[PDB]
């Protein structure tokens, strides 16, 4: 019988067990770790962990089902190359946000900084939203973002501009925007006599002049409906301009009312930081306090390599003011893309190792926002993955994913250009024990690396905690080839299956749940993205406004009454000019024409018609105007050129001309 | 160790057990009930029930996973405010129907009475269907329905009209329609010689004159394909009028044939009941027998309240005849929205309580459809929820949901304007014992209350049994704010995440299942709402007819051959008139124009053209007609005005005019 | 206490255990088989198999949850009649393919040979793709396919033509196409001096002249991007024509490069086999080697009935050459639709039985590709189902489904025209023991047969193995009636719920899994079929090209700038001719008209206008041309007819005519 002491070789006992028990039996490992020289049939175990050295000298751990209370979700399913949640996820007012970049490749081609969100603790995710448009100077350059977070109720992001040609960083800008909120407040609105502004007391409001604010039930004259911030007095007070004034003071003290805000109706504040010296990528975000935050960076283009952070001490009054802080020099080589977070006055930083044959990921902590550090190296050259994390109690809980299977270990060569099943791991480190020598990396889920191109969208994720759950949002692929080597060298997402990378989220229980389950099986028709309802006439009806930007082929089209109290049907053409034309017919090009009709049918009987004949028509470029009156209003009827064309012909005579005077002939 | 006797405090023993076992171990409670003074980590238990008095004196019960054989499903996912299954669910011919109202608020604004259906015992649900259109007098009033069901193969619904301004009842009408069914019958069609009617014998057909009937394999001349009911003879016999008559008697006895009904192709029968006096809402539906049914109602706008039912003894012959029967007067205060059902000669009624600090929900039974009652009060002022129920064996099985967390108990204050996790409960009551003093409310699932507005869509559901499962259909929210206080005070569903309320269904095992599992994981692309197929050219193709009623922006548009053996492409414009126009260009307004062309390109080389120049064009309001022939058919070429415009001009002379006689000058 | 020995009646012991245990307890049967005289509550058991004789003398076996490691998936959800995976499934480069036919009935009306695919080992499935268009001579005939598979990197399929009227076979053609793949190669491209072709060494490329090939990093001038096969030298070598020639030899020996194939960009090779004599259906596909394959067939229309295979020894050089092989004459009566697979030099064939009262399905093996056979009959007349299978170690693993509930057994009458729950079975047969007398059919899942028509889409599936899992893909219905007998006798898929048949997949573990779980819960918005993204302005945006072929009703339409560096918006009309017309107004027919405008509004102030009046207008068939200039270019302004219409009129006089010469009056 197996020892389950993490040290005794339990392989033979486990094998005998499996051989002697029915395949449907769930073998309970009783929470113990079993050392093995080959992984057994993990699927037949519950509540079991294995230790196994795939590479000798490098134990890793492997969780059976139910060993951790956790579950994997797929959270996007879009034809874009959807990857790089690194390192942008946050939770705000009970909503989990998973920002990422949707592109067509490792680079900024077709790229939109995007997010999906969950409003039910990760069970279900929203339709992707684009946070950036294509850059004005596309396709020379386009946007990129690996650092985003919330500070005092505003979203802040480091929006980079990079070249499509080489992914070269070209500009850094801090973009920020107020988060949408509803506030249910008591008192705090005053309006002084004989002037028109009302001051609103909303602690840490985070709003700027011009930001959207909506008022309900204010009980203060003129403070009502959709308004904007007029001035900001200080961090806890702003004003709005009302339409009117009164001869006495107003104060809604004791009255309950509602505010307020909108990310979508407020402009971005964009602060141009230029091409910050010695920076390759800005990555990760750590709210420090009420006034500011840090963002991670590295420089890995020229020697010497740098890794550190930029601290923005007062991002509200002074968004252009940052200070560079670097980790100790011995930890900078072969390092990039640090993840940073801040808890109880301690800034934590974990690097990505860039190669399996040199010292890799290292962990650092600072009590002075990066001026000085205490450092440790993870054993065995952890590389190719970022290590996003959160702190739960004493423990840093960190997640990482190999990019392709069997790359995780020190000395393991890259193994690309073939389909494989990369491992995703997590580990816990107690900050009061500050040593990683005996760190246990636990493989909790396996992803797919498609193999059709060298690049991998797997991993490079982001971590958040909400209530008693920790969430790791990260990329994963599937076996559908993007056909880069194939018929889609242009990487068009909308051909065949597009790009296999999509986002996943591992949700792991981190503390007790003192409620009955909120879990459901999703059995609805997903009806948010293209909301469809069968109308009372049995026809699929979409009431949402929509934009189709791709080429559209339509069959029979009816344009319904829609406009000016539904008196008219309307089509509006944009651009410099509109073109309505006629293709060359496949079968009978000799019939090429368009009929325009004021009535319901092709017969001239139903209404006046103008028929424009094609150049391929038997009657090449003929126009026939067919009506019971032809009335030319507002201008003379003239030939385009002078003395070149006629009225009538010998075989097409007008009966006469009704004139107010004799012809003027010259 | 823990006693699991439901009385002994098992808190400490349960904690010791949890501290001493691995988190992944499923602690089996052996179906026992354990009294606790605080709820433990419920997620680590299976087959365990806890009794806990959150409010002392008020024990409630909390089920771990697997204690009940049950599962929660999400069944709608639409941007409308989808709530109020109350109390309309029914099953008909193996299909489960979950009707509800999809609006934008607690009111009739933007409201359609809707349903979703399941054809696989609750695993998957259909695309929402709208049962009502917006009222003709929208937006002054609109429809509303909380009472719907089936009697003798017809759907009956009380369709109310209510004001948008105050949700005030304006009109009640009974609307009914035949349900669609296929019947496989032998014999029963006869056709007398020398006349055109055929009599069809279909037991309890439930059809009226004008209702749709389809015939197959009848073996009776003229009885074939899509037909309508010409006359109804009695409840078991009707006629159709055929095209022809014959000199011999037809009788299809012994022959197998098929019919033939349609909900969609049959008109509603609408019986205007006016503003039924002393009614606030009609709610719930109890089929009594082959002739009629009852509907619940209450009046709660003014004192004194009424709560009771309307019995329609013969809804087929006499839909406008009903009798009102009130519950006993002591049970009417603070009561509303009765759920009613009829089983084996007994009418059961359960009220909603309106106040946590006043006597609440009560249960009533009657053996003469509400003339006499036996009554019972639920302990502890059950309130804010309806209690839809079914009877299974000797038990009433009833379900209820608090609307926001911690509101269930007697004396518990409403707690709105903050996100929470409301509890959903069920209870059994033995009808022979007829005593609710020791009722056991079992919390089986928790929902979300969003908190952005005071109203909640959670709960207020409906219950049905199918085979050995009971189904509770009800509302639940998520954490996505509707931004009512924010940028969407207008409550437009199609902005942002729309409204968080959608429908769920709790599916509970109620009897033995003597079959292997039917369950599946859904892994398909949902392809019913907008059916897409990648065509042989690799382009997404939708073959279903579709209506887009929201504003549409399109890119490049090709209208394909579709009409009259696909000889033509066709666009029809509706309304009083059509308008095809040109926006003011952003960059080059001086270029504003539309080119209409009978050929494929902007060059006049490809076909005849007419170009209409915009007012912003350099050549303001110019028209150029460009063809190799300009032929004016059916009418004189005339100026709009008299002696106002000329033919040609001094720099644009016509070479000559070809006339049949000299000009008439005057 | 139950014996669990497969023979002793355990009914009473099992009833006693069930009565004595809480309902939530999972009763562990320890992988034993329990004999019962009635099936108990199977849902309360885990790891339990029952033996039960529903018909005396015909024991079948019934699996509780967890007895087999397996899961049912739903893999299509489309309004088409989706059925008949038989017998076409295959795996290729890690992608599981599930081809089927999507039609409107048992027959070829509306039919497209289709597939869905899985890129994650069956968890999630692709948007349906159509492999065939409607036949050129539709609706007289249409395509059909029940035999498809892969041989040397090419998809081969027997594409049949059948009448709509009777489903009578009209023609057989072998269609083949290269499969899409990306190849990562070293060396193998040479280009001799002074000529334009490069020869490409790709072992077993399976390409033909004109097939698509894409090249990356070749290091050989002109071998770049999208190309086509110019000549095939032999099975391992082909040439491509480049744009240019060099004066020295090029050879990329030692260099790493990539190719480059495409199913979609390569034409089918279609080999007309005519009307193959004595064939009802070609069904199933077995790859034999590098050169060819076999396809099953039967003939069941006239005597003698046949069952066998057609072996294509060299389908690459000689696709029109095949040899007919029949199974032994005693097994041919009452048999059809053979499933065939080839393993380690042995060809296996399993028939479908046509009736339950005659000897049914039989199994055959051949070591000479069907010339001689060893055979065995399955006990109890297995009928109505095909028995697709795979070989895993020493076992054939086969799957089958009764078409409606209780049809499986010998002597069981067809039970149609009522809803039921048909059982799906699998069984193992050890090929060494080669004896089926005690074969164990194990019921592992139940489907739905809708009952609205006599036909069933349930079952008739297909089987593949990928890694350590076997996959059975097959049909199932739901309770939603197609209303064939009802308002949809035309069987239009896009009315109501369309057709209830859709595809499912039972994924069963067949070997050890030495990886941690890949399983995820799908929580994403499905965003492949109609990819929607919320744009930065908050509006749903679909960037994919799309075709809408069903009738479309649109509301307000804007055609945005799309064409020629977005200078213009563009509408192209196809067909012989285009028609833009105006329906008769509902409320004001007297206003019927269309306004065409070069500017943004109805006011002629915004732009030049032409208004075509409807015949129903007060100004019937009037045309008003309203511009500040009317210029007729390229042609005379003429009347259509000679000497019939005038210029001007007595109340509409032109002021004068400006001419270069006097009118020519004649």
């Amino acid at each position: 019988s197996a020892k389950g002491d993490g040290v005794t070789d339990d392989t033979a006992a486990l094998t005998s067990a499996l051989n002697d028990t029915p395949v449907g039996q769930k073998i309970n490992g009783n929470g113990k770790t079993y050392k093995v020289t080959s992984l057994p049939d993990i699927s037949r175990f519950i509540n079991t962990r294995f230790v196994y050295e795939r590479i000798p000298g490098q134990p890793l751990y492997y969780a059976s089902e139910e060993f951790v209370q956790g579950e994997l979700f797929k959270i996007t399913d879009t034809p874009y190359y959807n990857a790089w949640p690194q390192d942008k996820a946050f939770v705000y007012e009970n909503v989990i946000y998973a920002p990422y970049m949707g592109s067509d490749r490792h680079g900024v081609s077709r790229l939109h900084v995007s997010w999906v969100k969950s409003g039910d603790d990760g069970q279900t995710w929203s339709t992707p939203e684009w946070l950036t448009d294509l850059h004005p100077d596309y396709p020379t350059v386009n946007y990129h973002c690996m650092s985003m977070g919330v500070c005092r109720n505003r979203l802040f992001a480091m929006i980079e501009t990079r070249t499509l040609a080489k992914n070269a960083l070209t500009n850094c800008a801090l973009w920020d925007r107020p988060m949408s909120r509803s506030l249910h407040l008591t008192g705090g609105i005053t309006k002084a006599a004989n002037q028109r502004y009302a001051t609103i007391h909303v602690p840490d409001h985070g709003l700027f002049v011009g930001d959207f604010v909506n008022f309900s039930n204010s009980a203060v004259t003129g403070v009502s409906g959709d308004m904007t911030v007029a001035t900001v007095i200080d961090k806890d007070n702003f004003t709005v301009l009302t339409p009117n004034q009164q001869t006495s003071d107003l104060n809604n003290a004791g009255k309950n009312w509602h505010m307020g805000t909108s990310f979508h109706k407020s402009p971005w504040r964009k602060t141009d930081l230029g091409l910050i010296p010695s920076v390759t990528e800005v990555h990760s975000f750590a709210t420090i306090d009420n006034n500011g935050f840090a963002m991670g960076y590295h420089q890995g283009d020229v020697a010497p390599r740098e890794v550190g952070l930029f601290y923005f001490p007062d991002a509200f009054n002074s968004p252009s003011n940052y200070v560079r802080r670097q980790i100790p020099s011995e930890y900078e080589p072969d390092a990039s893309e640090p993840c940073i977070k801040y808890y109880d006055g301690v800034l934590y930083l974990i690097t990505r190792g860039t190669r399996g044959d040199r010292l890799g990921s290292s962990l650092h902590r600072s009590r002075d926002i990066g001026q000085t550090w205490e450092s440790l190296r993870f054993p065995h050259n952890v590389h190719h993955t970022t290590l996003p994390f959160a702190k739960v109690g004493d423990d840093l809980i960190m997640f990482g994913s190999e990019r392709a299977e069997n790359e995780w270990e020190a000395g393991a060569p890259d193994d690309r250009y073939k389909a494989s099943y990369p491992r995703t791991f997590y580990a816990r480190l107690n900050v009061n024990n500050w040593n990683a020598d005996d760190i246990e990396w636990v493989n909790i889920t396996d992803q797919i690396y498609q193999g059709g191109i060298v690049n991998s969208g797997v991993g490079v994720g982001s971590v958040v905690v909400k209530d008693n759950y920790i969430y790791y949002m990260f990329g994963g692929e599937d076996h559908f080839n993007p056909w880069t080597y194939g018929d889609n060298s242009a990487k068009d997402p909308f051909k065949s299956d597009g790009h296999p990378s999509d986002l996943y989220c591992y949700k792991m229980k981190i503390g007790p749940d003192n409620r009955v389950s909120r879990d459901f099986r999703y059995g609805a028709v997903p009806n948010r993205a293209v909301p469809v309802f069968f109308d009372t006439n049995g026809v699929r009806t979409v009431p949402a406004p929509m934009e189709f930007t791709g080429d559209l082929g339509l069959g029979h089209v009816t344009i319904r009454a829609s406009t000016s109290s539904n008196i008219r049907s309307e089509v509006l053409m944009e651009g410099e000019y509109g073109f309505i034309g006629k293709s060359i017919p496949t079968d009978n090009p000799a019939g090429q024409r368009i009929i325009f009709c004021g009535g319901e049918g092709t017969s001239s009987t139903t209404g006046a018609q103008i028929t424009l004949y094609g150049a391929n028509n038997t009657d090449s470029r003929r126009i026939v105007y067919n009506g019971d009156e032809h009335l030319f209003q507002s201008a003379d009827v003239k030939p385009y050129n002078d003395n070149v064309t006629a009225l009538g012909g010998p075989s097409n005579r007008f009966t006469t001309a009704y004139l107010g005077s004799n012809p003027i002939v010259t």
Side-chain angles (χ1 to χ4, degrees), chain A:
Chain A
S1 53
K3 312 289 187 218
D5 56 10
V7 300
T8 308
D9 184 8
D10 276 338
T11 304
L14 263 11
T15 289
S16 121
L18 290 146
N19 288 166
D20 282 2
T21 90
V23 282
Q25 175 66 50
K26 294 303 170 58
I27 304 170
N28 199 328
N30 295 314
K32 286 168 171 27
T33 300
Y34 298 84
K35 181 238 156 72
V36 295
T37 54
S38 274
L39 293 166
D41 196 353
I42 295 170
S43 77
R44 298 171 59 187
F45 296 82
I46 57 165
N47 191 30
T48 299
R49 193 168 72 157
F50 302 100
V51 230
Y52 164 59
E53 293 176 19
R54 193 193 64 92
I55 304 303
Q58 295 191 58
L60 296 170
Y61 303 72
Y62 297 85
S64 80
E65 283 307 89
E66 301 180 14
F67 188 77
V68 337
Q69 293 185 277
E71 179 165 24
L72 186 66
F73 292 82
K74 187 172 187 173
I75 79 167
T76 71
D77 190 11
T78 282
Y80 283 105
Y81 198 115
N82 304 130
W84 317 281
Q86 68 176 144
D87 183 21
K88 300 183 275 289
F90 57 95
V91 355
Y92 186 76
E93 305 229 18
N94 285 103
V95 176
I96 301 168
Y97 291 77
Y100 64 101
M101 292 179 280
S103 60
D104 66 10
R105 74 195 79 198
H106 276 50
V108 303
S109 175
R110 302 184 163 101
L111 166 355
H112 291 282
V113 178
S114 305
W115 66 32
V116 287
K117 314 176 296 199
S118 177
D120 56 10
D121 300 336
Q123 294 202 252
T124 255
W125 296 74
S126 58
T127 303
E129 176 182 348
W130 291 339
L131 306 163
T132 53
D133 286 303
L134 298 184
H135 183 296
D137 303 324
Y138 194 88
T140 302
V141 299
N142 190 211
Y143 300 121
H144 184 268
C145 181
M146 289 187 174
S147 180
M148 182 184 283
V150 170
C151 183
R152 199 158 104 207
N153 301 120
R154 294 189 73 82
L155 180 76
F156 282 86
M158 188 61 90
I159 302 295
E160 297 166 359
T161 295
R162 310 185 78 97
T163 63
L164 269 82
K166 285 135 166 227
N167 208 0
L169 177 68
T170 255
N171 182 257
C172 305
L174 186 71
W175 293 18
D176 64 80
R177 223 172 177 181
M179 295 297 276
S180 302
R181 320 169 66 192
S182 290
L183 298 190
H184 317 286
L185 302 167
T186 300
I189 307 182
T190 45
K191 180 183 187 185
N194 305 307
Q195 59 81 235
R196 305 207 175 171
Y197 296 84
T199 122
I200 319 295
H201 182 249
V202 171
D204 299 319
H205 59 258
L207 304 171
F208 298 144
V209 172
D211 283 347
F212 177 96
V213 283
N214 169 271
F215 295 88
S216 310
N217 309 280
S218 72
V220 180
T221 303
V223 179
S224 188
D226 291 358
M227 305 177 82
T228 59
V229 181
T231 67
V232 299
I233 290 157
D234 62 28
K235 76 170 192 77
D236 298 336
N237 301 97
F238 63 92
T239 67
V240 293
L241 173 60
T242 79
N244 46 239
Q245 63 194 258
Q246 273 203 26
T247 57
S248 67
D249 288 346
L250 299 167
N251 185 334
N252 77 345
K255 299 298 301 209
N256 306 324
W257 58 282
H258 312 87
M259 216 186 78
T261 75
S262 175
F263 176 95
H264 307 269
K265 301 268 268 210
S266 297
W268 290 104
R269 184 184 58 169
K270 310 175 175 184
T271 302
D272 190 336
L273 308 172
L275 189 47
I276 303 185
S278 119
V279 174
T280 297
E281 260 178 358
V282 175
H283 166 101
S284 205
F285 182 105
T287 305
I288 296 306
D289 61 18
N290 212 37
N291 303 309
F293 56 76
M295 290 173 151
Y297 85 96
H298 74 98
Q299 194 281 125
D301 296 302
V302 287
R305 190 171 281 266
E306 300 179 22
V307 177
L309 62 100
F310 293 111
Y311 174 36
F312 289 79
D314 186 345
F316 286 78
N317 293 127
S318 315
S320 65
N321 188 223
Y322 55 84
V323 50
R324 187 184 221 110
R325 303 274 168 69
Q326 288 173 68
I327 70 173
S329 71
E330 99 177 278
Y331 293 101
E332 283 178 306
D334 311 298
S336 67
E337 303 176 351
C339 289
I340 57 168
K341 251 91 217 141
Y342 185 71
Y343 299 91
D344 289 306
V346 181
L347 185 63
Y348 295 94
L349 182 149
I350 311 187
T351 67
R352 182 226 271 215
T354 62
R355 29 196 304 179
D357 61 346
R358 292 215 202 117
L359 277 15
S361 283
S362 54
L363 200 212
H364 310 271
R365 53 135 85 124
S366 178
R367 313 196 245 132
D368 55 20
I369 326 196
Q371 298 176 77
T372 61
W373 298 97
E374 212 188 319
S375 303
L376 106 223
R377 202 119 227 176
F378 289 104
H380 306 303
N381 308 170
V382 174
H383 63 287
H384 290 170
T385 181
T386 51
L387 295 176
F389 65 98
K391 186 181 174 288
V392 176
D394 279 2
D395 284 355
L396 259 29
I397 306 172
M398 57 203 69
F399 292 83
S401 300
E402 61 184 358
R403 315 300 287 286
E405 184 174 5
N406 298 155
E407 283 187 2
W408 179 271
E409 290 96 334
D414 297 344
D415 198 5
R416 296 308 166 87
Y417 296 112
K418 70 174 208 235
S420 68
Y421 291 83
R423 297 160 300 174
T424 280
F425 302 91
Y426 91 104
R428 296 175 163 263
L429 185 144
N430 193 305
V431 302
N432 296 136
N433 294 331
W434 212 252
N435 159 247
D437 285 347
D438 297 316
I439 194 132
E440 311 189 334
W441 290 107
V442 181
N443 180 22
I444 38 153
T445 172
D446 282 5
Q447 278 50 251
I448 292 174
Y449 155 74
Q450 199 276 313
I453 60 174
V454 67
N455 309 128
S456 169
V458 357
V460 294
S462 192
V463 167
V464 300
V465 173
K466 178 180 187 272
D467 302 333
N468 63 310
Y469 291 92
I470 190 152
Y471 299 78
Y472 174 46
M473 292 112 119
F474 67 113
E477 305 184 346
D478 62 34
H479 287 305
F480 297 136
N481 201 307
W483 309 125
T484 282
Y485 306 122
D487 61 23
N488 196 197
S489 70
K491 295 174 177 290
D492 181 350
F494 307 104
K495 311 248 173 205
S496 178
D497 306 294
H499 293 105
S501 184
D502 268 298
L503 301 191
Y504 293 79
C505 176
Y506 193 85
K507 175 178 185 187
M508 175 187 285
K509 188 172 153 272
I510 236 59
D513 203 314
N514 314 114
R515 275 184 265 255
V516 147
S517 184
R518 286 77 62 211
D519 281 0
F520 51 84
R521 206 190 315 174
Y522 190 89
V525 166
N527 213 215
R528 297 317 192 110
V530 192
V532 171
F533 306 88
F534 280 81
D535 69 19
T536 53
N537 202 76
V539 182
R540 287 157 178 90
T541 295
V542 178
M546 285 190 84
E547 295 283 320
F548 288 86
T549 60
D551 292 348
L552 236 44
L554 309 185
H556 183 280
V557 174
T558 305
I559 314 292
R560 313 228 181 256
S562 64
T563 301
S564 184
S565 307
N566 298 311
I567 192 172
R568 70 169 178 272
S569 40
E570 180 165 289
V571 177
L572 250 37
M573 300 197 77
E574 298 189 331
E576 184 187 283
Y577 69 102
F579 178 73
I580 295 183
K582 176 74 203 72
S583 75
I584 303 177
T586 293
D587 299 309
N588 182 213
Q592 184 190 30
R593 65 207 190 276
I594 289 186
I595 303 172
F596 293 102
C597 191
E600 76 182 335
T602 58
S603 179
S604 72
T605 266
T606 69
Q609 302 183 150
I610 297 170
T611 295
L612 304 183
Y613 293 58
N616 298 96
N617 198 291
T618 296
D619 294 306
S620 189
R621 304 193 69 247
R622 176 176 280 201
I623 303 172
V624 174
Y625 316 80
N626 196 170
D628 288 344
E629 301 168 280
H630 296 291
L631 307 185
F632 288 85
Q633 193 179 9
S634 308
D636 309 326
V637 167
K638 314 199 280 191
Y640 186 92
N641 292 105
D642 184 35
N643 206 21
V644 133
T645 50
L647 283 162
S651 286
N652 305 73
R653 305 181 312 274
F654 286 109
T655 55
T656 180
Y658 290 84
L659 307 173
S661 66
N662 285 316
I664 289 159
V665 10
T666 269

